[PDB]
Design an enzyme around this catalytic site. Structure first.
Site, PDB file in Angstrom:
ATOM      1  N   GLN A 162     -37.582  50.725 -19.769  1.00 17.89           N
ATOM      2  CA  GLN A 162     -36.571  49.596 -20.370  1.00 17.89           C
ATOM      3  C   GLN A 162     -37.208  48.376 -20.594  1.00 17.89           C
ATOM      4  O   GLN A 162     -36.892  47.702 -21.537  1.00 17.89           O
ATOM      5  CB  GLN A 162     -35.083  49.510 -19.297  1.00 17.89           C
ATOM      6  CG  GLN A 162     -34.367  50.625 -19.725  1.00 17.89           C
ATOM      7  CD  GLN A 162     -32.973  50.477 -18.917  1.00 17.89           C
ATOM      8  OE1 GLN A 162     -32.705  49.501 -18.110  1.00 17.89           O
ATOM      9  NE2 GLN A 162     -32.196  51.518 -18.927  1.00 17.89           N
ATOM     10  N   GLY A 207     -37.290  52.035  -7.329  1.00 19.71           N
ATOM     11  CA  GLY A 207     -37.039  53.388  -7.730  1.00 19.71           C
ATOM     12  C   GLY A 207     -38.079  54.340  -7.043  1.00 19.71           C
ATOM     13  O   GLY A 207     -39.285  54.019  -6.968  1.00 19.71           O
ATOM     14  N   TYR A 220     -29.383  44.069 -17.241  1.00 28.64           N
ATOM     15  CA  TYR A 220     -30.779  44.485 -17.138  1.00 28.64           C
ATOM     16  C   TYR A 220     -31.345  44.129 -18.852  1.00 28.64           C
ATOM     17  O   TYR A 220     -32.345  43.933 -18.785  1.00 28.64           O
ATOM     18  CB  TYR A 220     -31.000  45.918 -17.175  1.00 28.64           C
ATOM     19  CG  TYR A 220     -30.676  46.528 -15.869  1.00 28.64           C
ATOM     20  CD1 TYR A 220     -31.231  45.908 -14.685  1.00 28.64           C
ATOM     21  CD2 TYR A 220     -30.278  47.802 -15.738  1.00 28.64           C
ATOM     22  CE1 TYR A 220     -31.202  46.446 -13.398  1.00 28.64           C
ATOM     23  CE2 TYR A 220     -30.240  48.150 -14.387  1.00 28.64           C
ATOM     24  CZ  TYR A 220     -30.651  47.559 -13.201  1.00 28.64           C
ATOM     25  OH  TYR A 220     -30.511  48.236 -12.096  1.00 28.64           O
ATOM     26  N   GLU A 224     -60.599  36.432 -18.638  1.00 30.46           N
ATOM     27  CA  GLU A 224     -61.309  35.361 -18.130  1.00 30.46           C
ATOM     28  C   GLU A 224     -60.300  34.384 -17.190  1.00 30.46           C
ATOM     29  O   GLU A 224     -60.798  34.100 -16.014  1.00 30.46           O
ATOM     30  CB  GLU A 224     -61.752  34.244 -19.327  1.00 30.46           C
ATOM     31  CG  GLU A 224     -62.689  33.306 -19.144  1.00 30.46           C
ATOM     32  CD  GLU A 224     -63.236  32.858 -20.434  1.00 30.46           C
ATOM     33  OE1 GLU A 224     -63.428  33.541 -21.236  1.00 30.46           O
ATOM     34  OE2 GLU A 224     -63.132  31.364 -20.553  1.00 30.46           O
ATOM     35  N   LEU A 278     -57.444  37.097 -21.312  1.00 30.24           N
ATOM     36  CA  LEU A 278     -56.774  37.254 -20.239  1.00 30.24           C
ATOM     37  C   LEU A 278     -57.824  37.513 -19.154  1.00 30.24           C
ATOM     38  O   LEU A 278     -57.933  37.129 -17.953  1.00 30.24           O
ATOM     39  CB  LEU A 278     -55.999  38.610 -20.126  1.00 30.24           C
ATOM     40  CG  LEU A 278     -55.046  39.024 -19.100  1.00 30.24           C
ATOM     41  CD1 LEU A 278     -54.887  37.785 -17.981  1.00 30.24           C
ATOM     42  CD2 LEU A 278     -53.923  39.728 -19.323  1.00 30.24           C
ATOM     43  N   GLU A 338     -34.726  50.677  -1.063  1.00 21.84           N
ATOM     44  CA  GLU A 338     -35.753  50.104  -1.822  1.00 21.84           C
ATOM     45  C   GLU A 338     -37.034  49.327  -1.078  1.00 21.84           C
ATOM     46  O   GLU A 338     -38.259  49.373  -1.290  1.00 21.84           O
ATOM     47  CB  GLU A 338     -35.141  49.156  -3.106  1.00 21.84           C
ATOM     48  CG  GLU A 338     -34.581  49.760  -3.948  1.00 21.84           C
ATOM     49  CD  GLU A 338     -33.940  49.012  -5.195  1.00 21.84           C
ATOM     50  OE1 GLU A 338     -34.755  48.235  -5.780  1.00 21.84           O
ATOM     51  OE2 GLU A 338     -32.815  49.247  -5.472  1.00 21.84           O
TER      52      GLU A 338
HETATM   53  N1  LIG Z   1     -35.545  43.844 -14.547  1.00 20.66           N
HETATM   54  C1  LIG Z   1     -35.184  45.218 -14.590  1.00 20.66           C
HETATM   55  N2  LIG Z   1     -35.057  45.769 -13.501  1.00 20.66           N
HETATM   56  C2  LIG Z   1     -34.743  47.122 -13.500  1.00 20.66           C
HETATM   57  C3  LIG Z   1     -34.221  47.833 -14.522  1.00 20.66           C
HETATM   58  N3  LIG Z   1     -33.882  49.026 -14.286  1.00 20.66           N
HETATM   59  C4  LIG Z   1     -33.815  49.115 -12.889  1.00 20.66           C
HETATM   60  N4  LIG Z   1     -34.435  48.120 -12.354  1.00 20.66           N
HETATM   61  C5  LIG Z   1     -35.004  47.975 -11.164  1.00 20.66           C
HETATM   62  O1  LIG Z   1     -35.556  48.979 -10.519  1.00 20.66           O
HETATM   63  C6  LIG Z   1     -34.953  49.195  -9.092  1.00 20.66           C
HETATM   64  C7  LIG Z   1     -34.873  50.696  -8.977  1.00 20.66           C
HETATM   65  O2  LIG Z   1     -35.884  51.488  -9.587  1.00 20.66           O
HETATM   66  P1  LIG Z   1     -35.624  52.452 -10.915  1.00 20.66           P
HETATM   67  O3  LIG Z   1     -36.706  52.005 -11.974  1.00 20.66           O
HETATM   68  O4  LIG Z   1     -34.184  51.994 -11.454  1.00 20.66           O
HETATM   69  O5  LIG Z   1     -35.730  53.966 -10.357  1.00 20.66           O
HETATM   70  P2  LIG Z   1     -36.768  55.009 -11.234  1.00 20.66           P
HETATM   71  O6  LIG Z   1     -37.930  54.188 -11.437  1.00 20.66           O
HETATM   72  O7  LIG Z   1     -35.975  55.489 -12.361  1.00 20.66           O
HETATM   73  O8  LIG Z   1     -37.014  56.100 -10.060  1.00 20.66           O
HETATM   74  P3  LIG Z   1     -35.794  57.066  -9.901  1.00 20.66           P
HETATM   75  O9  LIG Z   1     -35.281  56.723  -8.362  1.00 20.66           O
HETATM   76  O10 LIG Z   1     -36.119  58.468  -9.712  1.00 20.66           O
HETATM   77  O11 LIG Z   1     -34.702  57.005 -10.575  1.00 20.66           O
HETATM   78  C8  LIG Z   1     -33.694  48.581  -8.912  1.00 20.66           C
HETATM   79  O12 LIG Z   1     -33.839  47.590  -7.891  1.00 20.66           O
HETATM   80  C9  LIG Z   1     -33.741  47.668 -10.316  1.00 20.66           C
HETATM   81  O13 LIG Z   1     -33.539  46.319  -9.976  1.00 20.66           O
HETATM   82  C10 LIG Z   1     -34.214  46.976 -15.870  1.00 20.66           C
HETATM   83  O14 LIG Z   1     -33.755  47.571 -17.083  1.00 20.66           O
HETATM   84  N5  LIG Z   1     -34.846  45.666 -15.918  1.00 20.66           N
END
Ligand SMILES: Nc1nc2c(ncn2[C@@H]2O[C@H](COP(=O)(O)OP(=O)(O)OP(=O)(O)O)[C@@H](O)[C@H]2O)c(=O)[nH]1
Ligand SMILES: Nc1nc2c(ncn2[C@@H]2O[C@H](COP(=O)(O)OP(=O)(O)O)[C@@H](O)[C@H]2O)c(=O)[nH]1
Ligand SMILES: COc1ccc2c(c1)NC(=O)CN2c1nc(Cl)nc2ccc(F)cc12
Ligand SMILES: [Ca+2]
Ligand SMILES: [Mg+2]
EC number: 3.6.5.-
Lengths: 68, 421, 440
Positions: free
Chosen positions: C15, C143, C224, C254, C252, C183
């Site tokens: 995203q 994640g 998000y 540098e 960058l 997390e």
């Molecule tokens: N800034 C921002 N953070 C995000 C977004 N989507 C998820 N996060 C952060 O990502 C963290 C969790 O990791 P994810 O990326 O959603 O999970 P994943 O990478 O798909 O890995 P899986 O557990 O297998 O689904 C959370 O703490 C969210 O705050 C987003 O669109 N923007």
């Protein structure tokens, strides 16, 4: 002498760029292998006891046949 | 697509399983034929989680109906939606279980198990990506309690890497008289502690008390009770069934909710039986808990909260922050940010705003203590051991199931007493 | 040449790639179908934007990017969204089962099934490169894919590409938008596993971003989408030196000379100004001296910490838009006298400045005001270690009772990996203490 040094320094930068790809490659394979054994060892433990459960359901049914 | 596979077993199992499908079918826009007559496409986006898509655009529940007496069975097809199910997915005993656990687990249930296991596989192998299973049953008598836990054993053996989620209905002497229930439950829990990843405790003692005091029903029926269960079960699956922020599935629930494998017995909650603060107050209120346990007597290891309706989630965020602040001593301090919340825009039928509350509280030992007590009143006496040793069971097996459930309460207490410093 | 491949891993990473790549397109005049009317060099070129975009013979400009996620929900939306025509299918890689918030599943169980395919796809992107510079890896800390797949891919990239640069944009977890109670575990595990394999990592604190959104854009409960559109502005500024030409423009790489005094001290603090709504930016032009000043207000930082109570090892200013050196120099001189900026005693105290003239862009229907000029400060301050401290503390609260630790051990991991990771982190926090102490 200075050129002998100049080629020793570039041989070191190569030696070390290489030793680093090496030890990474190895650290990975070690981890990926210790992980298949661990995860398997765990799934095996689960089954061994789920089946020892099936053996106990034989023993239990064979006891009610020692009722008749 | 992430397919859960549903399994109803026994008298209690099939009935609470039935109104389940009636409710979620209505939320999702499915009539008893299996066609979609719905307004929003948010009701289809994740429909495959509980539904097989048949051409002729017919959605078929992924349900395996099971019992040891064809009576409960016939009721299902006769009732509403009985013809939405798959005719093959009915699997029926004849001889019945007669409120005996051994008859469901070791003997008569054994004879029907492999006939269920076959329908499981047919349904399982049709899955692009099988989440796992949820079993609706009772722990009080017969098929659901014993064959249901024997089916659990067998399924975990074929799918050791899939999630096992059960909705277990705990016996209450205020709702059933058959005296062997303290036996049936304890022998089931001995199995549930060892072979499920997530068990929602539906407590008939708390369902009664609710209906009797809050709902003021002088004589509540198994239909007034099951009205509470259907509300709970539509709630604790909102995040499985509807699109949301979190891509909820049965394992992400387990990972985040279960800090120790054995301590996986959730206290559910619903509200109302309204404003965003009244919801939250009620949702954490021991009067809205579907397990006869008071949270203020233990500590929350982990909590999940579903808000359903159209409401300011900014309000919800401050409201949920408020209850943890003012109630801070009731959440274990060694697990940070252990209270998550989700909101879904579509509320259950007939409520403009609901909340549903899944908790993992060390106060659930209350639930298990009450069963443990009624057990030993009989086991100290050796009462009715013949219904069980006759079917081939050792007395050691009652001792063991008993020591195990005693340990489970002992372990809940261990972490209720645990501190950080 | 100096082409960069971007890799977007998991929901956050993917995203955020959508925000960044939609922003780049608006910056460079590229349309959602990939055509660029201003590129007269069809099928190729070595223009600055080609560091991030290849060209097909039919005139399409194609991101040098790969999106990887262990499930298809999130990447399916790229495949069907406004910019679906921009990416070749083979750039968008998905599994069937995500990591369920579990570092082990992301690194070993589920990830081991797709890593070769992901590396292969990356190789097809590098083989189109006349002088590949490095990778830009976007991923959450939180994640299970974000943490465990990123770090598997990082080890692998180190093997297949040796010391070639790997930069990270890492989403640091925050309680307001967090997904998973685990997390902190995924966070430490991936920070430890990646530390050797990354040359520069910009952390984005979700709470920092969330507060800026609430406070400077008046968004009540930011999404998000709200946060991503702000992150991509900061990402845009950090990469604008790569994508754009410019007399006063500074590579960058540098800035990296200055930002990394030791291999492990490689976590620069980002700060960005002005973040300002249209209504509040109307009739109120913000000068070079105003935005520069904002960089030293901790409430504008990407990561929550107090630089005031730490020490600077480097401080960089990346300007874009209407900015000239005279102003910059004036503003820095005032700030030096009126602000708390202590450097460690072993490194010079000059500020390193780069200016890109192309003004910042905003995305249709965004909340950010289109301003005439912007700035991202990149500082290496010991204060960042606070973020490590906090996160390390949450990890400890749980690991002392081994809460949740069974979900990792059953996927093949050993407790020893946990203590090894936390010790590395313990050392990192000790390194950040040591650099700050004076000399003898
Ligand atoms: N800034 C921002 N953070 C995000 C977004 N989507 C998820 N996060 C952060 O990502 C963290 C969790 O990791 P994810 O990326 O959603 O999970 P994943 O990478 O798909 O890995 P899986 O557990 O297998 O689904 C959370 O703490 C969210 O705050 C987003 O669109 N923007
Ligand atoms: N809440 C609720 N409990 C039930 C219902 N039907 C049975 N029970 C409980 O289940 C126990 C009996 O088990 P039963 O369902 O008859 O097993 P089966 O006959 O093999 O299907 C009793 O203690 C009841 O309290 C029901 O519709 N609702
Ligand atoms: C705070 O600890 C957590 C508890 C639960 C969860 C979670 C973290 N994070 C996840 O991704 C899965 N998940 C949930 N799963 C399901 Cl099935 N229903 C839910 C309903 C409400 C809700 F807030 C979360 C969930
Ligand atoms: Ca060109
Ligand atoms: Mg995901």
């Amino acid at each position: 002498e200075k050129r002998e040094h100049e080629r020793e320094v570039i041989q070191k930068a190569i030696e070390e760029n290489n030793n680093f790809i090496k030890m990474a490659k190895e650290k990975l394979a070690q981890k990926m292998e210790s992980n298949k054994e661990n995860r398997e060892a765990h799934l095996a433990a689960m089954l061994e006891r789920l089946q020892e459960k099936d053996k106990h359901a034989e023993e239990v049914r064979k006891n009610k046949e020692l009722k008749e | 697509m992430r397919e859960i596979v549903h399994i109803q077993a026994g008298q209690c199992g099939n009935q609470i399983g039935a109104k389940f499908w009636e409710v979620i079918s209505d939320e999702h826009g499915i009539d008893p034929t299996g066609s979609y007559h719905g307004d929003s496409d948010l009701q289809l986006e994740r429909i495959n989680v509980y539904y097989n898509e048949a051409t002729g655009n017919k959605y078929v529940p992924r349900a395996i109906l099971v019992d040891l007496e064809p009576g409960t069975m016939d009721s299902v097809r006769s009732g509403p939606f009985g013809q939405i199910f798959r005719p093959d997915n009915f699997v029926f005993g004849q001889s019945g279980a007669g409120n005996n656990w051994a008859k469901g687990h070791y003997t008569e249930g054994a004879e029907l198990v492999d006939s269920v296991l076959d329908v499981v596989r047919k349904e399982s192998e049709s899955c692009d990506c099988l989440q796992g299973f949820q079993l609706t049953h009772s722990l009080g008598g017969g098929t659901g309690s014993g064959m249901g836990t024997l089916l659990i054993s067998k399924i975990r053996e074929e799918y050791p890497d899939r999630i096992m989620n059960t909705f277990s209905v705990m016996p209450s002497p205020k709702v059933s008289d058959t005296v062997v229930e303290p036996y049936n439950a304890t022998l089931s829990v001995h199995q549930l502690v060892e072979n499920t990843d997530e068990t929602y405790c539906i407590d008939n003692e708390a369902l009664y008390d609710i209906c009797f005091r809050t709902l003021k029903l002088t004589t509540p029926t198994y239909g007034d009770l099951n009205h509470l269960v259907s509300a709970t079960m539509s709630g604790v699956t909102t995040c499985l069934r509807f699109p949301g922020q979190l891509n909820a599935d049965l394992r992400k629930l387990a990972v985040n909710m279960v800090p120790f494998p054995r301590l996986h017995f959730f206290m559910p909650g619903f509200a109302p039986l309204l404003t965003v603060p009244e919801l939250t107050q009620q949702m954490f209120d021991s009067k809205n808990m579907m397990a006869a346990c008071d949270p203020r007597h233990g500590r929350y290891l982990t909590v999940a909260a579903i808000f359903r309706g159209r409401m300011s989630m900014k309000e919800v965020d401050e409201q949920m922050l408020n209850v943890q602040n003012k109630n801070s001593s009731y959440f274990v301090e060694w697990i940070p940010n252990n209270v998550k919340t989700a909101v879904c825009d579509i509320p259950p039928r007939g409520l403009k705003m609901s909340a549903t509350f899944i908790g993992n509280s060390t106060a659930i030992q209350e639930l298990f203590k009450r069963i443990s007590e009624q057990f030993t009143a009989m086991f100290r006496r050796k009462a009715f051991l013949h219904w069980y040793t006759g079917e081939g069971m050792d007395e050691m097996e009652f001792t063991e199931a008993e020591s195990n459930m005693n340990d489970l309460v002992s372990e809940y207490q261990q972490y209720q007493d645990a501190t950080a410093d | 040449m100096r082409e960069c491949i971007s890799i977007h891993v998991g929901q956050a990473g993917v995203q955020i790639g959508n925000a960044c790549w939609e922003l780049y397109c608006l910056e460079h005049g590229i349309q959602p179908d990939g055509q660029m009317p201003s590129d007269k060099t069809i099928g190729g070129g070595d223009d600055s934007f080609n560091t991030f975009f290849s060209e097909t013979g039919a005139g399409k400009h194609v991101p040098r990017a790969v999106f990887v996620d262990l499930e298809p929900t999130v990447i399916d939306e790229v495949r069907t969204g406004t910019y679906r025509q921009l990416f070749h299918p083979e750039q968008l890689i998905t599994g069937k089962e995500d990591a369920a918030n579990n570092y082990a599943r992301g690194h070993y169980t589920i990830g081991k099934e797709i890593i070769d395919l992901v590396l292969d796809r990356i190789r097809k992107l590098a083989d189109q490169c006349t002088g590949l510079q490095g990778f830009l890896v976007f991923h959450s800390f939180g994640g299970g894919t974000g943490s465990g797949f990123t770090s598997l891919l990082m080890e692998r990239l180190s093997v297949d590409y040796g010391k070639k640069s790997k930069l990270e944009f890492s989403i640091y977890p925050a309680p307001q938008v967090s997904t998973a109670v685990v997390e902190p575990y995924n966070s430490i595990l991936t920070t430890h596993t990646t530390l050797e394999h990354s040359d520069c990592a910009f952390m984005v604190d979700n709470e920092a971003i969330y507060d800026i959104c609430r406070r400077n854009l008046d968004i009540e409960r930011p999404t998000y989408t709200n946060l991503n559109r702000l992150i991509s502005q900061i990402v845009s500024s950090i990469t604008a030196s790569l994508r754009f030409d410019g007399a006063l423009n500074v590579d960058l790489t540098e800035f990296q000379t200055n930002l990394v005094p030791y291999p492990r001290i490689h976590f620069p603090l980002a700060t960005y100004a002005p973040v300002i709504s249209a209504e509040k930016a109307y009739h109120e032009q913000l000068s070079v001296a105003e935005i520069t000043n904002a960089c030293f207000e901790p409430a504008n930082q990407m990561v929550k910490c107090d630089p005031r109570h730490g020490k600077y090892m480097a401080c960089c200013l990346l300007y874009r838009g209407d900015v000239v050196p005279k102003d910059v120099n004036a503003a820095i001189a005032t700030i030096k006298t009126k602000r708390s900026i202590q450097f460690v005693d072993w490194c010079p105290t000059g500020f390193k400045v780069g200016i890109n003239y192309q003004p910042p862009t905003v995305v249709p229907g965004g909340d950010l005001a289109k301003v005439q000029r912007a700035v991202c400060m990149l500082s290496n301050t010991t204060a960042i270690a606070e973020a490590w401290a906090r996160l390390d503390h949450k990890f400890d609260l749980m690991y002392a009772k081994r809460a949740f630790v069974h979900w990792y051990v059953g996927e093949g991991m050993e407790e020893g990996e946990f203590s090894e990771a936390r010790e590395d982190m313990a050392a990192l926090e000790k390194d950040y203490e040591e650099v700050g102490v004076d000399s003898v």
